[PDB]
Amino acid sequence: IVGGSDAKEGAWPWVVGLYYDDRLLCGASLVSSDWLVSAAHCVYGRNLEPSKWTAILGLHMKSNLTSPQTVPRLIDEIVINPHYNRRRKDNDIAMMHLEFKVNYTDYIQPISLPEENQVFPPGRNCSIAGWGTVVYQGTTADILQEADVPLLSNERCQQQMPEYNITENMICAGYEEGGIDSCQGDSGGPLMCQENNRWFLAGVTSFGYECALPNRPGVYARVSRFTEWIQSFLH
């Protein structure tokens, strides 16, 4: 996360860090007691031995090794979206199953999927959080970083990203002046939006051109487009 600041413990209790070969590579969001939502590009091509992935839930600072609120879980199934197109970056979303369920606490809670026909309006600020790079081509955060970013319309995002195919399956967020954005290592994490005192998972961190440039917004997979499919896994 570029231009954000340290989160407080408990700030975003659905945010989960995903480890592979001992490195936190991507974020993910807890959506039930045993399913995460993350990005397909994070796991694509390396999902079929799913026990190589570990989720840490209730995570705040990577270096805090005596944290009693963090809970590890092996992953035992990873399902990429059946429409995912790697070349086009379209449908960039995956489901990951926790080997054993988690009990919810102030530090571990699921985030709601969007309500039917919920609108997340261009111009509204939503929040992002992750342990990825703090500046473009910089280093990964220790303490979870958070920031707020405004949504764009897809028309405006496509004009700013003419090199890319911005589809109905994507939602974009960032500032005209740049400075605040998701970055490498944040992929898979939530774009989350508040309505009526409740948080909804509006997007999943997907891609962008570099990070935090002016007039270059972050692109996220639009979760409302996948709610039926995500629901298909749940108990």
Q: H or E element: which one contains 75? A: strand 71-80
Chain position carrying tokens 């003419």: 162
Phi first, then psi: give them for residue 158, nearest 5 degrees: -65, -40
Helices assigned H by DSSP within the chain: 40-43, 154-160, 227-232
Joined tokens for residue 220: 């996220």
Task: Provide the domain count of the chain.
Answer: 2
Instruction: Quote the DSSP letter at residue 135.
Output: S
Write down the catalytic residue from 29, 34, 38, 41: 41
Experimental determination approach used: X-ray
CA distances 168 to 96, 153, 155, 225, Å, are 23, 11, 10, 8
**Amino acid identity at 21:** D
Which range marks the domain in which residue 195 is found? 1-12+111-224
| Neighbouring C-alpha atoms within 13 Å toward the C-beta of 68 | 0
CB contact at 8 A, 173 and 128: yes
Residues 99, 78 share a domain: yes
Q: CA 38 to CA 7: how far, in whole Å?
A: 20
Q: CA 132 to CA 18: how far, in whole Å?
A: 11
Residues 205, 93 share a domain: no
CB contact at 8 A, 68 and 18: no
Chain position carrying tokens 């079929």: 48
Please spell the DSSP secondary structure of 19-59, one letter per residue. EETTEEEEEEEE-SSSEEEE-HHHHTTS-SSGGGEEEEES-
Q: H or E element: which one contains 98? A: strand 94-98
Joined tokens for residue 53: 């992935």
Identify each DSSP E strand in 106-214 by its residue range.
125-130, 145-150, 170-173, 190-195, 198-207
Residues 8, 31 share a domain: no
Number of H helices, E strands in the chain: 3, 13
CA distances 202 to 32, 71, 125, 154, 175, Å, are 16, 25, 12, 14, 18
CB contact at 8 A, 172 and 220: yes
Write down the catalytic residue from 92, 182, 186, 224: 92
Residues 86, 68 share a domain: yes
Residues 115, 75 share a domain: no
Chain position carrying tokens 């405004």: 150
Residues 94, 27 share a domain: yes
Our answer to whether residue 92 is catalytic in this structure is yes
Our answer to whether residue 187 is catalytic in this structure is yes
Phi first, then psi: give them for residue 145, nearest 5 degrees: -105, 145
Write down the catalytic residue from 29, 127, 182, 187: 187
Length of the chain: 235
CB contact at 8 A, 66 and 60: no
Q: What resolution in angstrom units was achieved for this structure?
A: 1.9
Residues 164, 102 share a domain: no
Residues 115, 101 share a domain: no
Residues 119, 86 share a domain: no
Joined tokens for residue 156: 């405006």
CB contact at 8 A, 192 and 159: no
Phi first, then psi: give them for residue 26, nearest 5 degrees: -150, 160
Q: CA 147 to CA 3: how far, in whole Å?
A: 7
Joined tokens for residue 172: 């974009």
Q: Tell me how many degrees the CA angle 100-101-103 measures, rounded to the nearest 5.
A: 135
Q: CA 144 to CA 72: how far, in whole Å?
A: 17
Assign residue 127 the CATH number of its domain: 2.40.10.10
Joined tokens for residue 184: 């490498």
81: left (phi over 0), alpha (psi -120 to 50) or beta: beta
CB contact at 8 A, 157 and 202: no
Q: CA 68 to CA 56: how far, in whole Å?
A: 12
Distance from the first to the final alpha carbon of the chain: 32
Q: Tell me how many degrees the CA angle 169-85-49 measures, rounded to the nearest 5.
A: 115
Residues 163, 81 share a domain: no
